Ligand binder design. Structure first.
Ligand SMILES: O=P(O)(O)C(O)(Cc1cccnc1)P(=O)(O)O
Ligand SMILES: C=C(C)CCOP(=O)(O)OP(=O)(O)O
Ligand SMILES: [Mg+2]
Ligand SMILES: [Mg+2]
Ligand SMILES: [Mg+2]
Length: 299
């Protein structure tokens, strides 16, 4: 019922999960591991873990087993931001209210920490305790995180994003960028939550996919909107960063009003998909509240 309290509960759960998977690693208290801990744990809304937990919870899977996919997806997410902020990429000096990884620890440490966080995601999925999760479903989790994170998803989208700098690409190309760079990982969170539930989760996938696809695109449209109108102290990252690099964005192409409308229509579409699940007596309340927050949030 109370969404801010659920978000904070999720932040604590996910941070604990991440910390536990990071703690047995060697080279604690050296720069690369400290970079990983800074970039993964210090700040962030943990909405992808939120998606993993909320989805798995719908099928009655234990929060403790969901710690694994929640932490894995957040490792990929964390890695993606570390590399995204690099000078050769978006060259941003602030994130989550603090110096970016490459500023505080140097570029080499940032590259390697992001590299290692990606690897850790796959160590988590292959090694972590998930008692109710069949090997078949664990393999599917790994396969999904891989396809969603790599050239067919997030990385591919990062390449499209970089290519579209200064090119003011049309809506169809814009959507392709956003769905890959941001949509794909968000859909992986939902899929990993569902796969944790086995066959019952798999049966929901056609519908959860449509939900995930809509909130995932909406997530990036809101990110672009926030880049224009948000305050740096609230965002935790610099307002007007996109405009400075000439990024193809929703607000740059369509203006702020039409971008907002696109985000709102995507969320209404996400809500519609969830109605199909609520019909089968699955509790969609956390997923609908998350869907609304994705476009109501100011950070
Ligand atoms: O947090 P950022 O840098 O505004 C962003 O959302 C970061 C990001 C990195 C990787 C994939 N998706 C988004 P971006 O696309 O560079 O606008
Ligand atoms: C994929 C995108 C839009 C990058 C930022 O995601 P978030 O806005 O979830 O960033 P944090 O909460 O993790 O800082
Ligand atoms: Mg970027
Ligand atoms: Mg960026
Ligand atoms: Mg952005």
């Amino acid at each position: 019922m109370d969404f801010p309290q659920q978000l904070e509960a999720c932040v604590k759960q996910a941070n604990q999960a991440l910390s536990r998977f990071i703690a047995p690693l060697p080279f604690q208290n050296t720069p690369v591991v400290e970079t990983m801990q800074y970039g993964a744990l210090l700040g962030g809304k943990r909405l992808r873990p939120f998606l993993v937990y909320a989805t798995g919870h719908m099928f009655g899977v234990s929060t403790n087993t969901l710690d694994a996919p929640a932490a894995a997806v957040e490792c990929i997410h964390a890695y993606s931001l570390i590399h995204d902020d690099l000078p050769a990429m978006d060259d941003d000096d602030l994130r989550r209210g603090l110096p970016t990884c490459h500023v505080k620890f140097g570029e080499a440490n940032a590259i390697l920490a992001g590299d290692a966080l990606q690897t850790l995601a796959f160590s988590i999925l292959s090694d972590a305790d998930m008692p109710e999760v069949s090997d078949r479903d664990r393999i599917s989790m790994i396969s999904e995180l891989a396809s969603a994170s790599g050239i067919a998803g997030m990385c591919g989208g990062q390449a499209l994003d970089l290519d579209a700098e200064g090119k003011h690409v049309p809506l169809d190309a814009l959507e392709r960028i956003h769905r890959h760079k941001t949509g794909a990982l968000i859909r992986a969170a939902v899929r990993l939550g569902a796969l944790s539930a086995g066959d019952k989760g798999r049966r929901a996938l056609p519908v959860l996919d449509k939900y995930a696809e809509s909130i995932g695109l909406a997530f990036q449209v809101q990110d672009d909107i926030l880049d224009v109108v948000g305050d740096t102290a609230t965002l935790g990252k610099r307002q007007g960063a996109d405009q400075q690099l000439g990024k193809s964005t929703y607000p740059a192409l369509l203006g702020l009003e039409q971008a907002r409308k696109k985000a709102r229509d995507l969320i209404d579409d996400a809500r519609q998909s969830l109605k199909q699940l609520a019909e089968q007596s699955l509790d969609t309340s956390a997923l609908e509240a998350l869907a609304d927050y994705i476009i109501q949030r100011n950070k």
